Ligand binder design. Sequence first.
Ligand code: CLA
Ligand code: CLA
Ligand code: CLA
Ligand code: CLA
Ligand code: CLA
Ligand code: PQN
Ligand code: PQN
Ligand code: SF4
Ligand code: SF4
Lengths: 143, 741, 94, 35, 73, 157, 41, 31, 80
Amino acid sequence: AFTPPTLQSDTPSPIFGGSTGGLLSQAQVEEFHVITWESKKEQIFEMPTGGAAIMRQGPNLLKLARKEQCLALLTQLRTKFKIDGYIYRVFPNGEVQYLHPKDGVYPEKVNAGRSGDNTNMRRIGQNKEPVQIKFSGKIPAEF
Amino acid sequence: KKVKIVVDRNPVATNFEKWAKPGHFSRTLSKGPTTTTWIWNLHADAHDFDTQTSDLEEISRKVFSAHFGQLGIIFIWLSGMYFHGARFSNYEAWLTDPTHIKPSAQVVWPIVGQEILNADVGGGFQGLQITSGFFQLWRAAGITSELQLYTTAIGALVMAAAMFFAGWFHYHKAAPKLEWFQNVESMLNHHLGGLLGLGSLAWAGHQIHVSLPINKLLDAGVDPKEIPLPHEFTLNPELMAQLYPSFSKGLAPFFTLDWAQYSDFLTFQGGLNPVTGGLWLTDTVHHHLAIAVLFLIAGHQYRTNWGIGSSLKEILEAHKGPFTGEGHKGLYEILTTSWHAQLAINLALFGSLSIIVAHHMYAMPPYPYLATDYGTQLSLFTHHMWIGGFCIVGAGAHAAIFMVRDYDPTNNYNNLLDRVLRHRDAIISHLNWVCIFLGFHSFGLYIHNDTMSALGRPQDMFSDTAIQLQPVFAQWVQNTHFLAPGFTAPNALASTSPSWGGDVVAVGGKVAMMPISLGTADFLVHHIHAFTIHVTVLILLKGVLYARSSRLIPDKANLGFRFPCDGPGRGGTCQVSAWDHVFLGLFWMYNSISIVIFHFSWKMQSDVWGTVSANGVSHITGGNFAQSANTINGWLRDFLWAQSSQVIQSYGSALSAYGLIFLGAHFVWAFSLMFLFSGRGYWQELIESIVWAHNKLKVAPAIQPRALSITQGRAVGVAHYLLGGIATTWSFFLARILAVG
Amino acid sequence: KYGEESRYFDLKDLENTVGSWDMYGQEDKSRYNGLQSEFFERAANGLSRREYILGLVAIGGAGILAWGGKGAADVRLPTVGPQQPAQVGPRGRL
Amino acid sequence: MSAQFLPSILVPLVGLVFPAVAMASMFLYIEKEEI
Amino acid sequence: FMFLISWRGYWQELIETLAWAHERTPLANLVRWRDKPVALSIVQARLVGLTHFSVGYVLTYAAFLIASTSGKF
Amino acid sequence: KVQVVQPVNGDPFIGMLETPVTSSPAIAWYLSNLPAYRTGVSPLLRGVEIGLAHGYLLVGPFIKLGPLRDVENVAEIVGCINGAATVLILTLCLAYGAVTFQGEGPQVGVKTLSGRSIPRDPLQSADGWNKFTAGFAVGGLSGAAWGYLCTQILPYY
Amino acid sequence: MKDFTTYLSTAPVLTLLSVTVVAGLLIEINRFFPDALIAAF
Amino acid sequence: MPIADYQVFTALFLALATGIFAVRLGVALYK
Amino acid sequence: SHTVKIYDTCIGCTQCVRACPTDVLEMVPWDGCKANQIASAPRTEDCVGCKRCESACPTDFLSVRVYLGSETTRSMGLAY
Ligand code: CLA
Ligand code: CLA
Ligand code: CLA
Ligand code: CLA
Ligand code: CLA
Ligand SMILES: CC1=C(C/C=C(\C)CCC[C@H](C)CCC[C@H](C)CCCC(C)C)C(=O)c2ccccc2C1=O
Ligand SMILES: CC1=C(C/C=C(\C)CCC[C@H](C)CCC[C@H](C)CCCC(C)C)C(=O)c2ccccc2C1=O
Ligand code: SF4
Ligand code: SF4
């Protein structure tokens, strides 16, 4: 079994001068994501919102408007720095949902113990014709 | 450290083996053309040296040799122009009578009835009337001979051969190393002094010893055959002392600093020479000498192999203020290691230079009998305007390319580039608001004028006769320039240009330059120009700033500078790349420059160009700009329909080629609309059906035919659009200005 | 926030970390003087309901139509003035 | 043309009154949440 | 032609930038959009550009035809 | 050595930046002292003041630029135009307050720039925006009316 | 000269030379036989 | 002989009646 | 709220999972291919619809099919 890591709120943030591409009004009333990673030295990386930031030694904490920004930062950390990280979904009511490394290992590597949903056992051309599903509220591929 | 010449002996062998195999420069083009997309990408990536090699040294060597090849092409072009001026031109005949004989330097072969394009220009000569102004330039240089144009053509051919030999030599025999290209201090010290300063000094020397005596005799009125040759004017100071008496004492007052005795040929009057309508050539001599001294002084600012001089890095890094953090930290490294950033800066200032050239050359003509030929004047202005706008768009493109490829956030922390990238939303939003405000307060003024004219309320529209909008700042600036001589310009005998104010300069019965009055229509069209320039800036700056990343697409730098989209998701991410921002900015630059040249042509056909009749000035269109250029129907009718009668009734005459191009460019412009409006999937499926038809008859190409890529389609569409629009305007302008004037 | 150093996230204080701030709104009871506040709340008393503030727009549209009925002609306006001869046309028409 | 006053009332009605009321009504209805 | 040539991506970025502007402009943060401003979808803006193309085509030709025949006959 | 551009409230991950115009003490005082940022006083009087300012604002363009600007009775016709403009802006406020305040949403809250909790403003409510719309009603028509009376009592006009 | 002739055999060089010789042949045909509206034998 | 005021007013009232019919049809179509 | 489906022509090359910028796809154990792995889409609510997975699928025809459907605040990719 695998347990998700807790979001340690009192985690230091990278050195940054302040951008205009950061959080907006969506964070207060819908959602804002957050990414946490461990860096082995003080070095400069690129923000998903524009500009350069310096992440510090040890834990680094960065909140972002969208999950795609968090994954862009994570993939640039993994490629240009060989640094893994954790992404969390933080609701404004207080509940925090763990996100990307959901079962510990990365999704491109098998784990034996995942849900194989949305996997049809037919070919592309074996879907139903749209006339046979007429007036149903579903596309032919989700039958 | 220590600026010196470093090269590599024989890096690249000279042979034809890579000529046999196209696509050798890039690895992605290997293993043959499986599709026609390979064919298109082969031309698309021919000059993209970053995708060919990762070494800055090889890129720099390729750039240097490409510059040499371009210089050879330009020298071939100059040789061709001088050869056509020598052999197939009426230049000597035009020199005798420049007021009435229309310049011509190209003739056609009678093959299919095309000999009708050989106009009755005059001087017993038949040929195409040229609008490039080589005749005026050659008269300014003091040619007045056919043999000298041929000698210059041969010399330019020799220089082209020298350029090509230099490029081959510097790519194949002695290719400079990377640190040779990075000596920006030495490069600036030699371009300021040895290129620009020495070139200006040498041209001042030529103008003193060739242009001044020959043009003085021409202005006094002498057939060019009996004018003494330039060398014998240069050979002895006797004839020069007859023409300019200060040459009797020679170089003695120069070295004793009694330079005021040289005031007969080193003058400062301003205005125009009344005989020719061009600038005083003595004033041009004085100008070139002064700027040559200034540039040679400027060429000693930077430090090379000796302790004197200031380093560019030191000057940059010390210009830091409280509002900007580290300031210019990193600018020296991203300009001595990235070619695209230098290309962006140089293209921007080069296009601005071309636009400034267009402005300063209509405002006050520098060549004799250039003002009177309205055709070459309008053509030169419009050509330099279009070159400037194109170069500016390319500057935006290469700034975006540098932002995508050569921008490293490590060495650009909290500097001006970082500071701008960290508040791009503010800049873009504010430019958007400025664009909307300018669009309203420029175009909606025209629409209000249209509505009030169409409602029968001429008292309610914005005009000089109703609700006035006077350019008070511009009018006061004209007054300041007109009152400048004798006050704030004590040594000036006349203003810089007659456009500020004063008397009408008339040469050969035609107005050389007369004062331009600004009213409500000029106010409206200047605000239209500001609006169009601001929107083009908005698109280009938005592409540059969001090339790296975005709220919608956070990893746009991974996808590259030139990619079509990131899929139909997020609502649709079509044209998110900086390339597509350049693609839209091309159309917007086209719109801006088109409105600028329309305003130029209408304003000077209505208020400047015309004939004198010893009681007034009869303009080409008759003052219709002041009462019709505030209304879109006025632009459509009194300018775009009234002046179009010359190009549509040009069949059966020498302007029939302009008439034909006027329709062919319409065809090309509307042909662009196929590529601009459609999409790749339709054409791919249609090509599939055609491939079925070919398979049925065993005529299928092994190279698979593919529809043009999305970026390919956009590029083809914008190229055809700009070509068609610019060629339509070119044919219209040239036919109108060569049929009437 | 708990931003005593570089910690800009806190689940126990999630209000400040998200970015919800007043910017310029400040709480103060003192602003308008006496009697005039009562004067203005009496001026805008029953009108505060949505139906009656809709009825104000209804009487505004009634004024819009009253301009067309009697009000356009009171400021002359060419659309209700008289006419001066006529034009024939290209050919024999009217 | 009989009853010349009638266009003077009807044209503002279908140009200002009815369009403003229709636009306000549709703006209210498109964001009614719970119809 | 505006909707025909330019496509959805420049406009989405521009709208995001203007949403940033309005969400933190003083004296305008009192009001906010009930519906999130987005760029027109690809199919929708294709339809809008086609509609404007057809409307301008028809209006221009109707104006020219009726003017050039009624003004002359 | 001197710092003038800073992240707002410390965190560099919010869309604002501290700038000597968006948070200079004079401009911050002026923006806080505008009625629209007075969460303590009743919204009706705030709407009254806003309507007075805007009604007295809108007189001028119609006076100097309207279709009847060249006739003596421009002031009355402009007062009528401004009454109509106040009515249409009033129904704009009506529609806005009816669509954005049809329910409730008590999420997160609001604090000041120092770290003190503050109530989330009575203006942002169904009843609160009704008082603001009613305040803009009497204020808007009064500002137009005072603008009409200013055309006859001012010496320099 | 094998590589040079291979370069001369490349598609752009061959198509430019082919359209050049075809255009020149047509031009000289119209030079010696101008204004041929119909194929009158 | 141009039509009278009463004819215009009667026509407008009948148009109001058919407008009531139209909104009835529209409401039936919405349901 | 985009419909993402995986089909049995998948060869388990994991390229669709690597191409995804919002972590929608993952590899689950399978027995129908040589690599003994097939793609799955448990987090289609995070799918924006960019179709980068389709651009990475080498199977002809592709096995990771994305059907654009209902749009939410995450499918539209909005940060405001
Ligand atoms: C006849 C002498 C000669 C020969 C045999 C070679 C041979 C070679 N050169 Mg070289 N070169 C030469 C002269 C020569 N060069 C000159 C005079 C210059 C200065 C411009 C250069 C500058 C140069 C550079 C910078 C590079 C090479 C490279 C190469 C190698 C492969 C590229 C190639 O040639 O593909 C085929 C090229 C062509 C068939 C011609 C290219 C297109 C020409 C230049 C267009 C010129 C403009 C023309 C008028 C068209 C304008 C528009 C028109 C339609 C109106 C190759 C072995 C490349 C290399 O070594 O790879 C790493 C390299 O990057 N050359
Ligand atoms: C007084 C010295 C001098 C002069 C006159 C020039 C002149 C020029 N340079 Mg150069 N340069 C110099 C020093 C100089 N440079 C030094 C010291 C460096 C090392 C830091 C460089 C590095 C450099 C680079 C990297 C490039 C240039 C380029 C150019 C050309 C600019 C483009 C153009 O079209 O201009 C106007 C055109 C003309 C004026 C036509 C005249 C051309 C003649 C042949 C100039 C001869 C000057 C030459 C230096 C003499 C020595 C060469 C000799 C062995 C024949 C121009 C001709 C650019 C270029 O286009 O490449 C060719 C470019 O890429 N220069
Ligand atoms: C000093 C001028 C200069 C220089 C050196 C460069 C250099 C470069 N540019 Mg650039 N650019 C410039 C100006 C310049 N540009 C200007 C003025 C514009 C505005 C139009 C642009 C816009 C631009 C874009 C949008 C792009 C580049 C790109 C590039 C890079 C690759 C070019 C390539 O091989 O593509 C291929 C070049 C060709 C296929 C040549 C043909 C191009 C058209 C079809 C010619 C126009 C037709 C001509 C007028 C003849 C018409 C008559 C006809 C009927 C026969 C390269 C390093 C590309 C890049 O990726 O950057 C890394 C990129 O996409 N440029
Ligand atoms: C003036 C504008 C224009 C023009 C000329 C065309 C022309 C064409 N369209 Mg098109 N279209 C347009 C606007 C235009 N469209 C617009 C605005 C739209 C809406 C987006 C469409 C949408 C559309 C669709 C959806 C389709 C077409 C198709 C076609 C082709 C039909 C076949 C034909 O008639 O052969 C005539 C050929 C020509 C008119 C080309 C001109 C001949 C050239 C100039 C000769 C070459 C000489 C010389 C070498 C030129 C090169 C010079 C250079 C080397 C310097 C044809 C090439 C259909 C197609 O593909 O057919 C199979 C197709 O399905 N069009
Ligand atoms: C669909 C047919 C049609 C159209 C396009 C018009 C158009 C017009 N009418 Mg007219 N009208 C119509 C039918 C129509 N009418 C009929 C059948 C009658 C008889 C009762 C009248 C009686 C009438 C009078 C007395 C007057 C006009 C006038 C006018 C002009 C200004 C509009 C206005 O202020 O009056 C408002 C129009 C009405 C109150 C009745 C129109 C009801 C029609 C049938 C609605 C049809 C809607 C359509 C089917 C669907 C569109 C969707 C829509 C419901 C949102 C305008 C050009 C005025 C004028 O002459 O201008 C100078 C004028 O005073 N109309
Ligand atoms: C027509 C069209 C095509 C089809 C275009 C094709 C297949 C290219 C046709 C080129 C042919 C094969 C060569 C024709 C050669 C001419 C005689 C001269 C062409 C000019 C060259 C010298 C450069 C697309 O692929 C496309 C893609 C995306 C958006 C719009 C469009 C689009 O409009
Ligand atoms: C301008 C523009 C936008 C921006 C979208 C805008 C500006 C829409 C906003 C328009 C406002 C609402 C005014 C529209 C006025 C209409 C006449 C009102 C019609 C409403 C109907 C209900 C009648 C795109 O999103 C886009 C997407 C893809 C290709 C091209 C484009 C494009 O050109
Ligand atoms: S329509 Fe074309 S450009 Fe737009 S998202 Fe789809 S593939 Fe990309
Ligand atoms: S890219 Fe295609 S073949 Fe590869 S794992 Fe994904 S769905 Fe399967």
